[PDB]
Amino acid sequence: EVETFAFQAEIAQLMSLIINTFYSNKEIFLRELISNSSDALDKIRYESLTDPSKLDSGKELHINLIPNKQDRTLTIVDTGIGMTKADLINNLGTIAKSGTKAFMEALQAGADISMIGQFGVGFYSAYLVAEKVTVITKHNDDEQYAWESSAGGSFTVRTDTGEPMGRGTKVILHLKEDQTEYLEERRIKEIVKKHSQFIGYPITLFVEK
């Protein structure tokens, strides 16, 4: 049972700016998604400081990068706090309407797309490299859901019947055909060392074959 939703106008315009602008420094998407994961991991560690049973759904706090060349996908898994259904619908837990207002003022006043993370909407930089993004998520207080969008002004949300997650968020990037470099081992390593050396959680890059 799939529900289809319209993006708010300001979000749809942010995603088409990201899809259509000529901007070569596309590798920042990964920095942005890892930093979102690290923020959700901070949130569940804070909650467990007073209630330890909030880690009954998994005590390990980590980030995994899983390239898959046959599927042409890059997946970013974290065991962070996760999103409820209401977070998913509400622009994936962000204040995206006002953050796009600020961001897209800054672009006309000096800034460039690489500062998108300073406005709370870094998730959407995923569309620099992906034609389609799927977010599987499980929050302790809700069921597991799948959010899905190929841009074009709409997204879908459904109950995910697949592999139980325990707790966390899985961002699946279905990459554009000319962005396959972000599936190679040495290119991902180079981006993680460049932009994410101080993330306070173990980032494991899986290998293939």
Given candidates 27, 32, 87, 160, which one binds ligand A1AXW under the rule CB under 6 A? 87
Check residue 160 for interaction with ligand A1AXW (CB under 6 A): no
Choose between 78 and 160: whose C-beta lies nearer to ligand A1AXW.
78
Check residue 169 for interaction with ligand A1AXW (CB under 6 A): yes
Where residue 91 falls (left for φ over 0; alpha for ψ -120 to 50; beta otherwise) is left
Check residue 93 for interaction with ligand A1AXW (CB under 6 A): yes
Given candidates 36, 91, 100, 125, which one binds ligand A1AXW under the rule CB under 6 A? 36
3-state secondary structure 122-149: HHHHHHHCEEEEEEEEECCCCCCEEEEE
Check residue 83 for interaction with ligand A1AXW (CB under 6 A): yes
Choose between 93 and 99: whose C-beta lies nearer to ligand A1AXW.
93
Is 78 known as a binding-site position?
yes
> Pairing relation of β-strands 63-68 and 203-205?
parallel
Please provide residue 151's backbone torsions phi and psi, each rounded to the nearest 5 degrees.
65, -150
Q: State the residue number with the nearest CB to ligand A1AXW.
A: 93
Check residue 130 for interaction with ligand A1AXW (CB under 6 A): no
In the complex, the residues that contact ligand A1AXW under the rule CB under 6 A are: 36-37, 40, 78, 80-81, 83, 87, 92-93, 169
Binding-site residues from annotation for ATP: 36, 78, 97, 123
